[PDB]
Amino acid sequence: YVKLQVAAGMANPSPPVGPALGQQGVNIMEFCKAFNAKTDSIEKGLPIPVVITVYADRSFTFVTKTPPAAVLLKKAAGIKSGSGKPNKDKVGKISRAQLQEIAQTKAADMTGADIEAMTRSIEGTARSMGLVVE
Amino acid sequence: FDVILKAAGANKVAVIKAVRGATGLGLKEAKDLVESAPAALKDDAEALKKALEEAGAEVEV
Amino acid sequence: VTSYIGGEGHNLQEHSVILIRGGRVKDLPGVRYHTVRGALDCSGVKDRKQARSKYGVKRPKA
């Protein structure tokens, strides 16, 4: 019953994911191959969040989610890391459509009842990372 | 139907060469997967099967 | 007494048990004895090929 943000297809048995599943007991290489086979369609290099569901018989199923908004905002602005001092140092610029584009994909993981509400969550996400909206 | 390897004890090096071009897995990975037959290697099947069958590697589509 | 270690290279440390013999060293003051190479804890000189018996070196296996 663990939640991870492993890479798009770079699901190594490496320490980023390796020891996490070990305490439960699921086969490490089994999950790594299963995750990659369905995330090949995902754009390259994305920390797609997956929630693992392990059982008592040492079996597991997992569900993948849309990429995090902060990741989507980082690629939308063409940057790699956020502002060190958000709302003090400004490190990018994205249009409202770029907010709509990110909101639409994350709408599968949002909770707002409208595109405007979903956007405002993304707008709040943008301010918290120093990315101003332009 | 995914391409799988049944038997490759004839010209093991050539089968590695095929999957090297076919997939690009490194020499360690490519040799290990060939020696760990059977396993899922990947008209599309026929293309690599012809090269595999050329050196005597068995193919199961 | 002070004893002189001949040859090239040795393996003598403190608390080593060695055999000394007579023979002074001309330029070293106060040294009147020699250490017997190849006897007791003193090992022979390595790679010696001539005058081996003087340095405790067994004949090469050829």
Binding site: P13, G18, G22, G25 | K12, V13, L27 | -
Partner: protein
């Protein structure tokens, strides 16, 4: 966790001194490997895992050590049984008892082909190599941070090649004597492969890494019997890397730390920038040199002959011209912006790196290591 337990035939201890001694014949006569497992399993089928006296008298070495390492329900144990029949019979006996005393466990047996100790040429060539493959497979399929080598069972000759794996990869090894009662995490002296000895072989492995096969005679002509184990004969007149070879190839491929050096032109230029910029450049080069991730980030425009520029950051008064040889990070020039701009202005027209290395002996060399005793 995962326990890579070596398996030894201490389980069938109860048949000690009885007329047919416990040998591969004895397993054979009673029916076979599976049939003999039940007979062995009977003698200690009752003993517990929490009872101290049974741990030290009535159970195998794998069971005693595993019970001491704290085997639980959520665990996975591997038994590297021997190739001999008496070895495998006990393997099928330990597993039944382990899957009985701790239900919900996953024990699987690997039969290391040709692990017999009655023949030398086979053991030197197929035993340790196969055992080296099997262990290095499980560690790489479960991560170095989760495997615990258990070199207590089995022959005394496998133990060198279990612990040595632990030292190289990083997994620990835990041992416990029969009469003792304390687990002993064996010391792990940091070791690696001798780069100096192995460096000339780099082009040789390069062919194999590309064409995946080389004719044997050409391999022998190209290249000291220790190097032989690095190479496994595929069998059709070619040779490919043995499992040890893949370790060496990766060791000769992993990036390492670097120690900066300064050409005679850099040392003249560093000092005149020290007065205006404190001791900032001294730390930066050392910081970049001893961090591979930092080095790969800062590569500005790359020049010929393996030269590539570095810079502290945006709007800085220094940009370095460095290149790598062995474990040394040679520094050729250290220039400010205007000199840097003109060089790149010149390099637009023709080649640049050729002109620098051409005058290496007259102007730059010798490179002096970056240790300073300013006082």
């Amino acid at each position: 966790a995962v326990y890579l337990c070596t398996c030894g035939t201490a389980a069938a201890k109860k048949f000690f001194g009885q007329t047919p001694r416990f040998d591969a014949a004895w397993v054979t006569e009673h029916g076979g490997v599976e049939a003999a497992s039940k007979v062995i399993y009977d003698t200690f089928r009752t003993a517990r895992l929490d009872d101290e006296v049974a741990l030290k008298r009535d159970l195998s070495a794998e069971i005693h050590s595993l019970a001491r390492m704290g085997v639980n329900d959520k665990d996975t144990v591997v038994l590297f049984s021997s190739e001999t029949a008496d070895g495998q019979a006990c393997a099928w006996a330990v597993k039944r008892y382990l899957e009985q005393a701790r239900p919900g466990i996953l024990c699987r047996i690997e039969v290391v082909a040709g692990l017999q100790v009655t023949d030398a040429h086979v053991f030197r060539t197929a035993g340790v190599l196969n055992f080296t493959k099997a262990v290095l497979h499980e560690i790489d399929a479960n991560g170095t941070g989760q495997c615990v080598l258990n070199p207590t069972g089995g022959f005394k000759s496998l133990v060198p090649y279990t612990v040595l794996i632990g030292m190289l990869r990083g997994v620990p090894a835990k041992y416990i004597f029969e009469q003792s009662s304390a687990l002993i995490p064996l010391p792990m002296m940091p070791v690696e492969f001798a780069r100096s000895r192995l460096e000339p072989l780099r082009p040789l492995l390069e062919r194999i890494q590309n064409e995946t096969a080389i004719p044997r005679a050409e391999l022998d002509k190209a290249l000291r019997e220790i190097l032989d184990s690095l190479f496994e004969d595929v069998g059709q007149g070619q040779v490919s890397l043995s499992p040890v070879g893949f370790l060496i190839w990766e060791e000769l491929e992993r990036p390492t730390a670097l120690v900066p050096f300064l050409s005679r032109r850099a040392l003249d230029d560093l000092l005149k920038m020290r007065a205006t910029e404190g001791t900032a450049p001294d730390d930066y080069i050392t910081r970049v040199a001893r961090s591979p991730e930092q080095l790969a980030i800062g590569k500005h425009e790359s020049w010929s002959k393996g030269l590539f520029w570095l810079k502290r950051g945006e709007h800085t008064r220094d940009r370095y011209l460095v290149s790598v040889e062995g474990w040394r990070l040679l520094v050729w020039r250290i220039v400010d912006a205007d000199e840097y701009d003109d060089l790149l202005t010149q390099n637009r027209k023709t080649d640049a790196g050729a002109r620098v290395v051409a005058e290496r002996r007259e102007k730059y060399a010798p490179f002096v290591r970056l240790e300073l005793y300013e006082d």
